[PDB]
């Protein structure tokens, strides 16, 4: 039991996070109300104090004489799902015949979508994201030709054995999920759930994955968060003998049922590496076009 006053009256333990703002319904743009001339003292909408950290509260009505306008313009297309639920390229995998890369009829791809600028820039607008996704696999030869070839795609989660060859025992796929499909068939397509151990994936992790000294040789791990590493995508031509055709697999991701937190400034320098925000120091360019003088167009 409790008895001393400071304990009885303390707020230690309040799990109810007080919120200063609440969301309101806004299916259309706000309307404009009629307004007239105002010649008042004390009243001053135009003047602000940006130092406070808040945006201007001044509206059209208070700055000029406005008419009434019934705005029925929809706000539907700017929802998270509307913006993100559009399949975009996130991975390309080659399976050549005579080659330097994967001349063995199989390949392993770490599931990381940061190798493509269009998609990457969009998701990096937010710090945390939680979503389900629809993946589509488009296969064909390097010329875009379709050939009678059977492939096997297998999802290898962290801890599961990664195939080391076209004949690896791991292809028995007794528990991992696999998709067998022909190039002649339409693109393969499946739904993937939100799989992180965290409540959300995060495109930015300012920290290290482990404890200890963080010496030069371990700096490759700064910013690496296992919670974002969902596993490997393995593919092979289904046979004990090398395929007759060179293949290319394009991977498209379409997010759905999206939630995002903490908006961030948008990338303005070319991307260089998947794992980090490194930029070319000798080519730091302005965010946009420039002109000769501030007083000329």
């Amino acid at each position: 039991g409790d008895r001393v006053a400071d304990v009885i009256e303390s707020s230690i333990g309040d799990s109810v996070s007080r919120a200063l703002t609440h969301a309101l319904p806004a299916p259309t743009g706000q309307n404009t109300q009629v307004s007239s001339h105002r010649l008042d003292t004390g009243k001053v909408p135009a003047l602000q104090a940006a130092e406070i950290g808040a945006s201007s509260n001044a509206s059209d009505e208070s700055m000029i004489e406005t008419r009434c306008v019934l705005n029925s313009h929809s706000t539907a297309e700017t929802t998270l799902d509307s913006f993100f639920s559009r399949a975009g390229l996130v991975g390309e995998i080659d399976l050549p015949l005579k080659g330097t890369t994967n001349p063995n009829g199989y390949a392993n791809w770490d599931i990381d979508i940061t190798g493509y600028a269009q998609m990457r820039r969009k998701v990096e607008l937010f710090t945390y994201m939680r979503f389900d996704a629809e993946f589509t696999f488009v296969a064909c030869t390097p010329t875009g030709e379709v050939v009678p070839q059977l492939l096997q795609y297998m999802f290898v989660p962290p801890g599961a054995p990664k195939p080391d060859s076209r004949e690896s025992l791991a292809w028995q796929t007794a528990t991992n999920p696999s998709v067998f499909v022909k190039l002649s068939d339409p693109p393969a397509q499946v739904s993937v759930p939100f799989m992180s151990p965290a409540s959300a994936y995060q495109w930015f992790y300012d920290g290290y994955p482990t404890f200890g000294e963080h010496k030069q040789e371990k700096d490759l791990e700064y910013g690496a968060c296992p919670n974002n590493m969902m596993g490997t995508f393995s593919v092979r031509t289904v046979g004990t003998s090398k395929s007759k055709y060179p293949l290319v697999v394009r991977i498209y991701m379409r997010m759905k049922h999206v939630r995002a937190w903490i908006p961030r400034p948008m990338r303005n320098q070319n991307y260089l590496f998947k794992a980090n925000p490194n930029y070319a120091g000798n080519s730091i360019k302005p965010t946009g076009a420039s002109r000769t003088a501030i007083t000329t167009l």
């Binding site: 309307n31 700055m63 397509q189 799989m195 965010t287 167009l297």
Partner: protein, 242 residues
């Protein structure tokens, strides 16, 4: 089996098709979602947040990039001299590209709504002055003088305890929506021009800097909306990202 007949579209892969696809992990249940601050529900929420407008988008050497974030004002000769100008077109190349509004704008083909630019004076407390900021709707050429600019929508700013002032760029268009404006026939969708002039003069006493800077912050009004989702004009990658 049941009599069916395949129609055109069959086997096609539309990247924006909102369909149903087989689940790879049956009976899998995602990690519960705890509370995380700052959840955004609609991009329009972000468009109402003011970000810095690079009105002074002239310096280009790395060492001077930070200078683009602010432009100056200083004691003049009282002839209603011009201080600066810029197009109001938000989705057009220029000053607006530095703002989050301009960037998000790039992912949409059409937009509609009033805009606002708040100017913050960062001179010394002892500096005073009055500026005339004007918005010239389409059709009006760059005002040659303050008298001409004064004929459009404008605000007369007086420096004081309130460091900032807000210029509202009201929605004045012939069409309900504007596509991104650019030189050519698409200049049809131009929003107009914004010019800043000295109404009085930047006055300062002995002992205070003769030059101070103004920082411009821009965002959208609550009647702003965008439509027809598209890919942004920039692709931030040269070769493959490794």
């Amino acid at each position: 089996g049941f009599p069916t007949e395949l129609k055109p579209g069959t086997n096609q892969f539309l990247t924006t098709d909102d369909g149903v696809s087989a689940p790879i992990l049956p009976n899998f249940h995602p990690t519960p979602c705890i509370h995380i601050p700052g959840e955004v529900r609609n991009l329009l929420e972000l468009c109402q947040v003011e970000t810095i407008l690079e009105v002074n988008n002239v310096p280009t050497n790395a060492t001077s990039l930070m200078e683009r974030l602010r432009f100056p004002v200083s004691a003049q000769a009282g002839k209603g001299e011009l201080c600066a100008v810029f197009r109001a077109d938000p989705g057009r190349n220029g000053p607006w590209q530095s703002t989050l509004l301009g960037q998000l704008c790039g992912y949409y083909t059409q937009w509609s709504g009033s805009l606002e630019v708040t100017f913050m004076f960062t001179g010394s407390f002892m500096a005073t002055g009055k500026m005339l900021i004007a918005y010239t709707p389409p059709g009006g050429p760059l005002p040659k003088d303050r008298a001409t600019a004064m004929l459009g929508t404008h605000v007369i700013w007086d420096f004081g305890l309130q460091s900032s002032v807000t210029l509202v760029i009201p929605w004045i268009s012939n069409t309900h929506y504007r596509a991104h404006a650019r030189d050519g026939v698409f200049d049809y969708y131009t929003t107009g021009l914004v010019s800043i002039w000295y109404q009085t003069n930047y006055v300062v006493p002995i002992g205070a800097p003769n030059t101070a800077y103004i920082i411009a912050l821009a965002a959208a009004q609550k009647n702003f909306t965008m439509k027809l989702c598209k890919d942004a004009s920039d692709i931030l990658q040269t070769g493959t990202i490794q």
